[PDB]
Design a protein around this ligand. Structure first.
Ligand SMILES: *[C@@H]1O[C@H](CO)[C@@H](O[C@@H]2O[C@H](CO)[C@@H](O[C@@H]3O[C@H](CO)[C@@H](O)[C@H](O)[C@@H]3O)[C@H](O)[C@H]2NC(C)=O)[C@H](O)[C@H]1NC(C)=O
Ligand SMILES: *[C@@H]1O[C@H](CO)[C@@H](O[C@@H]2O[C@H](CO)[C@@H](O[C@@H]3O[C@H](CO)[C@@H](O)[C@H](O)[C@@H]3O)[C@H](O)[C@H]2NC(C)=O)[C@H](O)[C@H]1NC(C)=O
Ligand SMILES: *[C@@H]1O[C@H](CO)[C@@H](O[C@@H]2O[C@H](CO)[C@@H](O[C@@H]3O[C@H](CO)[C@@H](O)[C@H](O)[C@@H]3O)[C@H](O)[C@H]2NC(C)=O)[C@H](O)[C@H]1NC(C)=O
Ligand SMILES: *[C@@H]1O[C@H](CO)[C@@H](O[C@@H]2O[C@H](CO)[C@@H](O)[C@H](O)[C@H]2NC(C)=O)[C@H](O)[C@H]1NC(C)=O
Ligand SMILES: *[C@@H]1O[C@H](CO)[C@@H](O[C@@H]2O[C@H](CO)[C@@H](O)[C@H](O)[C@H]2NC(C)=O)[C@H](O)[C@H]1NC(C)=O
Ligand SMILES: *[C@@H]1O[C@H](CO)[C@@H](O[C@@H]2O[C@H](CO)[C@@H](O)[C@H](O)[C@H]2NC(C)=O)[C@H](O)[C@H]1NC(C)=O
Ligand SMILES: *[C@@H]1O[C@H](CO)[C@@H](O[C@@H]2O[C@H](CO)[C@@H](O)[C@H](O)[C@H]2NC(C)=O)[C@H](O)[C@H]1NC(C)=O
Ligand SMILES: CCCCC/C=C\C/C=C/CCCCCCCC(=O)O
Ligand SMILES: *[C@@H]1O[C@H](CO)[C@@H](O)[C@H](O)[C@H]1NC(C)=O
Ligand SMILES: *[C@@H]1O[C@H](CO)[C@@H](O)[C@H](O)[C@H]1NC(C)=O
Ligand SMILES: *[C@@H]1O[C@H](CO)[C@@H](O)[C@H](O)[C@H]1NC(C)=O
Ligand SMILES: *[C@@H]1O[C@H](CO)[C@@H](O)[C@H](O)[C@H]1NC(C)=O
Ligand SMILES: *[C@@H]1O[C@H](CO)[C@@H](O)[C@H](O)[C@H]1NC(C)=O
Lengths: 241, 289, 48, 48
């Protein structure tokens, strides 16, 4: 596990189809307003757009390279913190600059570098112990131009059982060398789908990266019943344009 | 009914340190244009007069703001970009330009807000034998977008297919400037700094040298909050701003509330003149009362 | 009679709302214009 | 763009068109005038 491994006997993704539902609205600027209607034009997720679902369960471990186009809405339904972040780039190898945005067990790390990215990036968690053991996102990095590390914290990385409890929503945009990030959260109690409702997102970051972004991949967590063997836990994430 | 102000209020944030003029404009090393570098500026006083005794700028041009107002404002989200170009290439560092630099190395947005500074550095960056350490890109498929950088070094072919450097129609895309002590002005090195920022729409932590005063309430006064100047009456407010919001606006786009940059208290702003007045006259031919 | 009242009120409220248009100026806020620009260009914007 | 590898221009200014649109247009009745002047006289080659 010192280098990065490729899972054996992994089922191919099933690009399940769902619909957005008045989701993905965010604050257009930093001005305070109240008791009013405001007409604006911007990059928004149209109501009832078609979104694609990706799942981690049993032997399905969905993490393909996904096009970025003109911006992304990304919503994760989970109960045991499987989805940990993203890698954004153009070629997704060490021939160009890529940006990693991850939440490891104790910090939020953002780094822009020439990454020798691994086609199967993941975290490793031990089921019997419930402790993070390995991180295998990349093999090498050089010519780093941007770095950000947040204050330390603690995450509950152990596996859980039951229904999905947390819905975490993000919106990503790229403009004039800045990667805009918006975030929102909701408690849920569901089984399989993406819940329908309305929830406004708030700005979190405006990263001065200055890189070309055409593709992105999600970083997931693999739960190992024993050393050497690879397993998974239930989780879903959905993408819209 | 008209009322005139009878006071003056100035509120800026708590700032003690001077901005890193020395670090930015006096750095020992500067990067190549194709690999221009960016630096964040925050929590400092922008008292640029200190430069008068040490620096002389061939080029200084500002966009979105008048050069004579810089001392009275606060700036949000401040970055400084640094690199080196040739004398003839300086003209290309401006919105809406074309040429090798503006196409493949460094481009400004069409709605740029900020300032551009440049000065000659022959004595520092030129040698009698010729200095070739500064480089720029002269071959590329397509043009850069604003504030985009490309630091790849893949060999280049017009056909677009991979090639090996020792082969026809295959070139290395990066070229080296030749800076000689005896060169003409058009071929002499220049150091360039580009400052970008936003104004009067969001929180700020870089400000000009100004003295803050106390807060006067329930009285028509002239006020200046983080550079936004006006006249009105200030009262305590029940609105609750989010941390990323600094100003509030009404349906007429008039600025009607602001967060004080020192106490974080939200204040409502109201106009001074208000009310209808009528005059009753028996005719000036009869009386002046 | 109700619509007479409504028409008058709507006219005044529309007049109030129309102050938010730029009319081609860099901004619709006189305070912003005068805080950013010197007199010469401020005059052009204010004239618009 | 073929000029990029061989020529450097101290002065380049365009009238009636934006420099960034040149690659997307076709031009009618094109003429080129050539001559030589002094450094201080270059500024005089402009309308008005
Ligand atoms: C929602 O549905 C739309 C279509 O109604 C999906 O957009 C489609 O996405 C595909 C996959 O990228 C596009 O195909 C590709 O387009 C270009 C041109 O051919 C090129 O990259 C590839 O060769 C390929 O054909 C397709 O053009 C595009 N359709 C439209 C009308 O834009 C969209 O992905 C759906 N939303 C999801 C999946 O989240
Ligand atoms: C999550 O990522 C963060 C950020 O990389 C990790 O914290 C960093 O851990 C490295 C070691 O892996 C620390 O480097 C060393 O730290 C001390 C500093 O006194 C010393 O041994 C060395 O000089 C070296 O710098 C680094 O300081 C530390 N960064 C911060 C900001 O604390 C963290 O460990 C990761 N968490 C997990 C669970 O992997
Ligand atoms: C991006 O990373 C690449 C790969 O490391 C960097 O290219 C390398 O840059 C070094 C430092 O300038 C070059 O110097 C070389 O070092 C020794 C002598 O010091 C010797 O091998 C050569 O004579 C040369 O001077 C090195 O050649 C070069 N390597 C390769 C494989 O290209 C590059 O500088 C980085 N780019 C940026 C913008 O930071
Ligand atoms: C960039 O990534 C490529 C692909 O992984 C690396 O190519 C390796 O290069 C080394 C050294 O020549 C070889 O031993 C390997 O066989 C190559 N492939 C792999 C899969 O390891 C390359 O080294 C990386 N870095 C650079 C600077 O090119
Ligand atoms: C501005 O720069 C000048 C020139 O360096 C400074 O005056 C010099 O001060 C040094 C140190 O005392 C003397 O050795 C020089 O003889 C001075 N040069 C003169 C008098 O022409 C001056 O102090 C600087 N001013 C400030 C405010 O920093
Ligand atoms: C900016 O500095 C001022 C002056 O010290 C701070 O205002 C005082 O804060 C103390 C500590 O809370 C209070 O006891 C005083 O009543 C405040 N006013 C005065 C006049 O001293 C202010 O808190 C600082 N602001 C920030 C954002 O740090
Ligand atoms: C652009 O001009 C450069 C400089 O003349 C060309 O590169 C030179 O090519 C000649 C002929 O092969 C070599 O002898 C020189 O050593 C090269 N100079 C270098 C590498 O610095 C280059 O080929 C030209 N490019 C195009 C596309 O015409
Ligand atoms: C060191 C980083 C400074 C960041 C700048 C701060 C705020 C925004 C802009 C300020 C204007 C500074 C430019 C001074 C030019 C001096 C002109 C001259 O001498 O002719
Ligand atoms: C994937 O879809 C196919 C039909 O295309 C279906 O037969 C199969 O059961 C699905 N598998 C999963 C794991 O959803
Ligand atoms: C996952 O495995 C369990 C246990 O065998 C099975 O009941 C379930 O249907 C499987 N789910 C999918 C989606 O294949
Ligand atoms: C700039 O750096 C030089 C070189 O170290 C130093 O001598 C000088 O004092 C610094 N400051 C100024 C204002 O030049
Ligand atoms: C104008 O002037 C006289 C003197 O003030 C005034 O009293 C009188 O009413 C006026 N004349 C008229 C109305 O013819
Ligand atoms: C220009 O003419 C000179 C003199 O004949 C010649 O050497 C050169 O190759 C020509 N082309 C360029 C791009 O200078």
């Amino acid at each position: 596990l010192d280098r990065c491994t490729t899972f054996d006997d992994v089922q191919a993704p099933n690009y399940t189809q769902h619909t957005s539902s008045m989701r993905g609205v965010y604050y257009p600027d930093e001005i305070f307003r109240s008791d009013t209607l405001y007409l604006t034009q911007d990059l928004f997720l149209p109501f009832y757009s078609n979104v694609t679902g990706f799942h981690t369960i049993n032997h399905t471990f969905d993490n393909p390279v996904i096009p970025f186009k003109d911006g992304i809405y990304f919503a994760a339904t989970e109960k045991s913190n499987v989805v940990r972040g993203w890698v954004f780039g153009s070629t997704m190898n060490n021939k160009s600059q890529s940006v990693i945005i991850i939440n490891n067990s104790t910090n939020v790390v953002i780094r822009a570098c020439n990454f020798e990215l691994c086609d199967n990036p993941f975290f490793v968690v031990s089921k019997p112990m419930g402790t993070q053991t390995h991180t295998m996102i990349f093999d090498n990095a050089f010519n780093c131009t941007f770095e950000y590390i947040s204050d330390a914290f603690s995450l509950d990385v152990s596996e859980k059982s039951g229904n999905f409890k947390h819905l975490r929503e993000f919106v990503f945009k790229n403009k004039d060398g800045f990667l805009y990030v918006y975030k929102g959260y909701q408690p849920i109690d569901v089984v399989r789908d993406l819940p329908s409702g309305f929830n406004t997102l708030k700005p979190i970051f405006k990263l001065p990266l200055g890189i070309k972004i055409t593709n992105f991949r999600a970083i997931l967590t693999a739960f190992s019943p024993a050393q050497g063997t690879w397993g998974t836990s239930a989780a879903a994430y959905f993408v819209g344009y | 009914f008209r009322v005139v102000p009878s006071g003056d209020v100035v509120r800026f944030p708590n700032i003690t340190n001077l901005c890193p003029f020395g670090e930015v404009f006096n750095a020992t090393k500067f990067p190549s244009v194709y690999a221009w570098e960016r630096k964040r500026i925050s929590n400092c006083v922008a008292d640029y007069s200190v430069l008068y005794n040490s620096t002389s700028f061939s080029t200084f041009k500002c966009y979105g703001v008048s050069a004579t107002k810089l001392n009275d404002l606060c700036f949000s989200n401040v970055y400084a970009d640094s690199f080196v170009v040739k004398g003839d290439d300086v003209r290309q560092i401006a919105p809406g330009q074309t040429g090798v630099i503006a196409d493949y190395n460094y481009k400004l947005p069409d709605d740029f807000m900020g300032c551009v500074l440049a000065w000659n550095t022959r004595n520092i960056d030129a040698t009698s034998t010729g200095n070739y350490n500064y480089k720029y890109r002269y071959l590329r498929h397509g043009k850069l977008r604003p504030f985009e950088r490309d630091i790849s070094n893949v060999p280049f072919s017009s056909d677009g297919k991979p090639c090996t450097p020792p082969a026809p129609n295959c070139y290395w895309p990066l070229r080296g400037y030749g800076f000689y002590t005896t060169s003409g002005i058009g071929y002499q090195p220049y150091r360039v700094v580009v400052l970008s920022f936003e104004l009067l729409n969001a929180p700020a932590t870089v400000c000009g040298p100004k003295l803050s005063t106390d807060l006067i309430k329930n009285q028509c006064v002239n006020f200046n909050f983080n550079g936004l100047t006006g006249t009105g009456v200030l009262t305590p407010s029940s609105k609750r701003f989010q941390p990323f919001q600094q100003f509030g606006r009404d349906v007429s786009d008039f600025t009607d509330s602001v967060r004080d940059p020192k106490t974080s208290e939200i204040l409502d702003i109201s106009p001074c003149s208000f009310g209808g007045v009528s005059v009753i006259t028996p005719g000036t031919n009869a009386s002046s009362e | 009679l109700q619509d007479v009242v409504n028409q008058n009120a709507q006219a005044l409220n529309t007049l109030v709302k129309q102050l938010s248009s730029n009319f081609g100026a860099i901004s619709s806020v006189l305070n912003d214009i005068l805080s950013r620009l010197d007199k010469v260009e401020a005059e052009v914007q204010i004239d618009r």
